[PDB]
Amino acid sequence: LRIIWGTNVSIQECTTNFRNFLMSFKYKTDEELYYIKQLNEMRELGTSNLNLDARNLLAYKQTEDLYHQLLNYPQEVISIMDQTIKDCMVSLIVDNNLDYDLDEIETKFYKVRPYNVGSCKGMRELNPNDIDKLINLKGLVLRSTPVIPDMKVAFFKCNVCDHTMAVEIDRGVIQEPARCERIDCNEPNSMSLIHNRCSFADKQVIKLQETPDFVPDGQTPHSISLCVYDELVDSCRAGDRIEVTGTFRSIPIRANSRQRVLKSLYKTYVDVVHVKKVSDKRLDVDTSTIEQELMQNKVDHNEVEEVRQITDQDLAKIREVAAREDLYSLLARSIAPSIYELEDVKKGILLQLFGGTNKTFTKGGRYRGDINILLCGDPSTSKSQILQYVHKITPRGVYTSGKGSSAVGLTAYITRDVDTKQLVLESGALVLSDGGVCCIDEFDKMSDSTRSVLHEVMEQQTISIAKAGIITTLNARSSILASANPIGSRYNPNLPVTENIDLPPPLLSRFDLVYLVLDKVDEKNDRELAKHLTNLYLEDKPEHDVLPVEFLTMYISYAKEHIHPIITEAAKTELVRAYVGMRKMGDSDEKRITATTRQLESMIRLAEAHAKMKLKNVVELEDVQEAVRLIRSAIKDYATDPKTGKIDMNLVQT
Amino acid sequence: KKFASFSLTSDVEERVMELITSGDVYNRLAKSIAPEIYGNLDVKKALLLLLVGGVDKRVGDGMKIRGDINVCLMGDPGVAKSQLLKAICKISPRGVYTTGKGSSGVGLTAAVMKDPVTDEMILEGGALVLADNGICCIDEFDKMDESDRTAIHEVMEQQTISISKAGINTTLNARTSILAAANPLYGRYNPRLSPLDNINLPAALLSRFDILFLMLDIPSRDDDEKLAEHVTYVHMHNKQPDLDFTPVEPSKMREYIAYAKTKRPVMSEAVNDYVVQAYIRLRQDSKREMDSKFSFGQATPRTLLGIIRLSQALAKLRLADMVDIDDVEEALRLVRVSKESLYQ
Numbered sequence: 002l003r004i005i006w007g008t009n010v011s012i013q014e015c016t017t018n019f020r021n022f023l024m025s026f027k028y029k030t031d032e033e034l035y036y037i038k039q040l041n042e043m044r045e046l047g048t049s050n051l052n053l054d055a056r057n058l059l060a061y062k063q064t065e066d067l068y069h070q071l072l073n074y075p076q077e078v079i080s081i082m083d084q085t086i087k088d089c090m091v092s093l094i095v096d097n098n099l100d101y102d103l104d105e106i107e108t109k110f111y112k113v114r115p116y117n118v119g120s121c122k123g124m125r126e127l128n129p130n131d132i133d134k135l136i137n138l139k140g141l142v143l144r145s146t147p148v149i150p151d152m153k154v155a156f157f158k159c160n161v162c163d164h165t166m167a168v169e170i171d172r173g174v175i176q177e178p179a180r181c182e183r184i185d186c187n188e189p190n191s192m193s194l195i196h197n198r199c200s201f202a203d204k205q206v207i208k209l210q211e212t213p214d215f216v217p218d219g220q221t222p223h224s225i226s227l228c229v230y231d232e233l234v235d236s237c238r239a240g241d242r243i244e245v246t247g248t249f250r251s252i253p254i255r256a257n258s259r260q261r262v263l264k265s266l267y268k269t270y271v272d273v274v275h276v277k278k279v280s281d282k283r284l285d286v287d288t289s290t291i292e293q294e295l296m297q298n299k300v301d302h303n304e305v306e307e308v309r310q311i312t313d314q315d316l317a318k319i320r321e322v323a324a325r326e327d328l329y330s331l332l333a334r335s336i337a338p339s340i341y342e343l344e345d346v347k348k349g350i351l352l353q354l355f356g357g358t359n360k361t362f363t364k365g366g367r368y369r370g371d372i373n374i375l376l377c378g379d380p381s382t383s384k385s386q387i388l389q390y391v392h393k394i395t396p397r398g399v400y401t402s403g404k405g406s407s408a409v410g411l412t413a414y415i416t417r418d419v420d421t422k423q424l425v426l427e428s429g430a431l432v433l434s435d436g437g438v439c440c441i442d443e444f445d446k447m448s449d450s451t452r453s454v455l456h457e458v459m460e461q462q463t464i465s466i467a468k469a470g471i472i473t474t475l476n477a478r479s480s481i482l483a484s485a486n487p488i489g490s491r492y493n494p495n496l497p498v499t500e501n502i503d504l505p506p507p508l509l510s511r512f513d514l515v516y517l518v519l520d521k522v523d524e525k526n527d528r529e530l531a532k533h534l535t536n537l538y539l540e541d542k543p544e545h546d547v548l549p550v551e552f553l554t555m556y557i558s559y560a561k562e563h564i565h566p567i568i569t570e571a572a573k574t575e576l577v578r579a580y581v582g583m584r585k586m587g588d589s590d591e592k593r594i595t596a597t598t599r600q601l602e603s604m605i606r607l608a609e610a611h612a613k614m615k616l617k618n619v620v621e622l623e624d625v626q627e628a629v630r631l632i633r634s635a636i637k638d639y640a641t642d643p644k645t646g647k648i649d650m651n652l653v654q655t
Numbered sequence: 656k657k658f659a660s661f662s663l664t665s666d667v668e669e670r671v672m673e674l675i676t677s678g679d680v681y682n683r684l685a686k687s688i689a690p691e692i693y694g695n696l697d698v699k700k701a702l703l704l705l706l707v708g709g710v711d712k713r714v715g716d717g718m719k720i721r722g723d724i725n726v727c728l729m730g731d732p733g734v735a736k737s738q739l740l741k742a743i744c745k746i747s748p749r750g751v752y753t754t755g756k757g758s759s760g761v762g763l764t765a766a767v768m769k770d771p772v773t774d775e776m777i778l779e780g781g782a783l784v785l786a787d788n789g790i791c792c793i794d795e796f797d798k799m800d801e802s803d804r805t806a807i808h809e810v811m812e813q814q815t816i817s818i819s820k821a822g823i824n825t826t827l828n829a830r831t832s833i834l835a836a837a838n839p840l841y842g843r844y845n846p847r848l849s850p851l852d853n854i855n856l857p858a859a860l861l862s863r864f865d866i867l868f869l870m871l872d873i874p875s876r877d878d879d880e881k882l883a884e885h886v887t888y889v890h891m892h893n894k895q896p897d898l899d900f901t902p903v904e905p906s907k908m909r910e911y912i913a914y915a916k917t918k919r920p921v922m923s924e925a926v927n928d929y930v931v932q933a934y935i936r937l938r939q940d941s942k943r944e945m946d947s948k949f950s951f952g953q954a955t956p957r958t959l960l961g962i963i964r965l966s967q968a969l970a971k972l973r974l975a976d977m978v979d980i981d982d983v984e985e986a987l988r989l990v991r992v993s994k995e996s997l998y999q
């Protein structure tokens with residue numbers, strides 16, 4: 002009936018349609034009223050924000066137009082939606098006469114957060130006509146400014162009679178009174194602004210490294226600015242992978258701080274309304290690293306969830322899958338189905354993903370269960386696909402190369418902000434990966450200067466800085482997954498291991514597992530691999546007893562969250578016995594990787610990981626035995642001569 | 656014209672249909688690449704296949720397999736490698752040409768600078784980013800620095816460049832093909848030394864090429880006559896000497912390649928059986944040669960992937976929806992031709 006100038010929105014039609022959709026819609030559990038229960042749970046718990054999947058609107062017939070209205074005119078539609086939600090809430094509470102205490106709901110505020118806007122084409126592909134629309138983005142957080150106070154109400158005082166006023170901001174402008182509003186006092190221009198008596202809101206700016214799905218020819222990465230307000234501040238940390246929904250904005254900027262002249266070319270940014278921090282293609286963040294942030298989220302009444310929710314049926318399925326007697330082989334085979342065999346490599350990858358148990362001593366002291374692995378072997382094997390897959394499955398991590406890095410580029414640096422024109426501190430690769438896995442390729446090309454900084458990271462999971470202006474110690478709780486190629490052309494089995502890898506022998510002892518990926522010619526294995534690889538081109542799309550990636554991630558995340566194994570004396574005896582065996586066995590030098598205490602630590606970590614898998618809380622003899630077997634098999638001591646340190650190509654099994 | 660902007664229409668369709676009707680598309684296109692250079696036919700076929708490319712496959716779970724073909728030429732001085740490099744760079748719509756130490760550091764990859772127009776920071780792409788979805792030609796491949804070699808290594812590996820330095824932590828897109836040229840370590844090739852001792856590059860880097868050609872200069876009173884006749888005729892006039900063959904101009908070649916790039920042939924079962932048998936036989940044979948220290952590199956799964964890519968490229972050039980045995984025949988034929996210079 003009565004539309005709004007500039008738009009086509011009618012308030013009455015929109016509110017009626019939204020109410021009807023709220024009161025009649027089911028997910029077609031799929032036959033029950035979907036949103037009635039969500040509102041009921043909201044009021045039982047007292048939450049104030051409703052997350053609206055905009056895709057749910059395209060299902061109902063009425064709201065096939067409200068979808069486009071929301072995508073085109075978010076400003077009016079969101080306010081209409083909030084008011085309609087409050088009205089529906091009062092109707093629900095009163096129409097059934099539950100409890101006469103309804104003042105709180107009638108006084109508080111509500112809000113709606115769209116979170117499934119359609120697929121976009123990237124920030125840089127937008128045009129001027131797309132300003133003030135609803136869009137979504139993917140990217141990586143880099144920096145965040147401190148909280149900015151943003152005034153909403155100004156407090157004036159009269160300098161002759163103490164009369165005090167209050168003025169509310171109006172589209173970003175304050176109207177200062179030109180005369181005291183008293184009859185006794187009417188002095189003109191006598192009102193002064195007391196800043197400390199004003200009311201301020203919360204504001205912050207985030208720097209985002211966008212990761213669009215489609216990339217044109219010759220396009221390099223860039224950065225974007227995001228504005229978050231009120232309860233969403235401090236909800237993102239550098240290194241987080243996020244999905245964001247917001248409005249596309251523009252604004253002119255002043256040329257200098259003295260004049261009030263503006264520039265014709267505008268500056269673009271995004272106003273955020275919802276942030277998604279979870280996915281079904283990767284593991285959930287390690288909660289042992291965000292202990293205080295969850296508490297702060299609870300204190301701040303922000304409804305962003307860090308970990309995915311679990312249904313009862315999902316937990317039941319998890320238990321049944323964990324109850325079978327082929328669990329280890331099945332889980333290993335699930336990892337990277339497009340990679341053939343490599344049973345022990347995949348077992349090591351799975352154990353690294355699970356991780357060991359973190360001890361935290363009262364009165365100070367920290368042990369961590371991060372597991373480090375080095376991959377050495379013939380150049381043409383599939384040891385970089387592994388790094389790619391592990392990078393894409395993990396929640397945090399950076400994929401670096403040894404020769405294309407630097408000591409400063411991995412730790413921290415200072416840069417001048419192009420907007421504020423001041424100097425700020427940024428993070429390096431190893432701190433951006435805290436709580437995740439850092440993949441290093443061609444580890445043997447890294448300079449000694451560059452390699453120097455890995456010692457502290459792998460020996461205390463921290464880094465120290467002594468630079469101009471900054472002196473502090475940082476957390477580096479990240480796992481290392483490296484790879485190396487042999488000296489020359491191929492791994493020569495007529496020489497010791499230390500004559501094939503271009504690293505100091507002492508360095509090779511700090512890893513938990515070392516793999517020798519050898520390539521042997523056997524017609525059966527060649528036939529198998531060739532058939533496996535040629536089956537992938539039978540049809541234009543992939544179709545390859547394997548669990549789906551979503552269930553695998555859910556299972557591993559649940560196991561990491563909810564199981565914490567502990568070692569027993571039966572395991573202690575075997576641990577000490579095996580360590581003494583390794584130390585004694587092999588006892589004319591630099592022929593083999595000498596055993597050290599790091600090996601005992603590695604056995605502890607691997608046994609804890611094996612116990613943590615399969616939902617056990619106690620480490621036992623089988624766990625330690627499997628850990629020792631895996632450590633021995635990775636370096637394949639079975640085919641090695643204890644005296645000369647050579648390898649027999651006939652005793653090695655594909 | 657860019658390939659992505661392709662579109663069928665009466666005008667383009669008539670020219671294309673004429674080209675197919677004339678028959679012998681493969682050799683006719685192959686012989687038109689740098690027609691002022693005598694001989695060098697199989698290298699030209701490999702270059703044409705590098706122009707066309709293979710098929711990119713999305714395997715699922717985020718895994719990725721390239722479809723671009725990398726070719727390396729390495730031979731004695733005065734064999735016209737640079738002419739072929741430059742001609743290929745000129746034919747390609749997004750081609751770039753580089754030579755050794757003239758381009759280094761941020762000349763490759765990208766650097767950080769400030770935009771004059773806008774007040775924001777940006778990255779300017781180097782040689783490897785300017786030729787994205789094109790051909791990157793590298794001359795004097797053996798005289799480069801280690802950092803450039805590592806960058807090329809990664810680009811051939813996974814079509815990306817990772818940088819972690821002061822003020823930059825990002826990953827670039829490098830969907831480009833590599834065409835390199837190199838020289839033996841002592842000038843001319845020395846048949847008294849192992850093949851891996853005649854070159855300065857690591858063996859793995861050489862193994863990372865689909866096709867690796869050896870071009871030696873063995874004097875012969877017969878072929879020298881033909882080469883001299885060709886060159887001196889080319890200098891007397893401005894054209895090539897053959898009259899029974901007409902070369903196709905670059906625009907028509909570009910049009911036909913753009914049309915061919917829209918196809919995506921698929922693997923049947925008999926072709927797969929043939930491929931597995933050939934792979935087994937070749938892999939078994941190569942080990943004995945490499946034990947005698949007479950092989951640039953032992954066969955590995957990358958050889959099988961290169962064979963598959965070349966078969967796909969030939970199928971695409973034929974304008975067919977399926978692959979046949981003859982395509983795999985030609986792929987193996989070329990991969991065998993790659994090394995006659997080492998058996999004379």
Ligand SMILES: Nc1ncnc2c1ncn2[C@@H]1O[C@H](COP(=O)(O)OP(=O)(O)O)[C@@H](O)[C@H]1O
Pocket residue numbers: 339340341342343379380381382383384385386530534720812956957960
């Ligand atoms: N076991 C395997 N399973 C699947 N593909 C393989 C396997 N072994 C080799 N390949 C193929 O060979 C290539 C190996 O190269 P790549 O893994 O990049 O080398 P590296 O990782 O050793 O640097 C891949 O393209 C892959 O398709």
Ligand SMILES: Nc1ncnc2c1ncn2[C@@H]1O[C@H](COP(=O)(O)OP(=O)(O)O)[C@@H](O)[C@H]1O
Pocket residue numbers: 691692693694731732733734735736737738882886
């Ligand atoms: N097969 C050939 N046909 C015609 N000209 C040739 C041939 N081989 C060499 N040349 C001539 O000799 C010169 C070789 O120089 P260049 O192109 O740099 O090759 P290279 O770098 O291999 O020496 C060129 O100018 C070219 O004209």
Ligand SMILES: [Mg+2]
Pocket residue numbers: 384385386812
């Ligand atoms: Mg690789």
Ligand SMILES: [Mg+2]
Pocket residue numbers: 736737
């Ligand atoms: Mg030259």
Ligand SMILES: [Zn+2]
Pocket residue numbers: 159160161162163164181182183186187188191
């Ligand atoms: Zn007053």
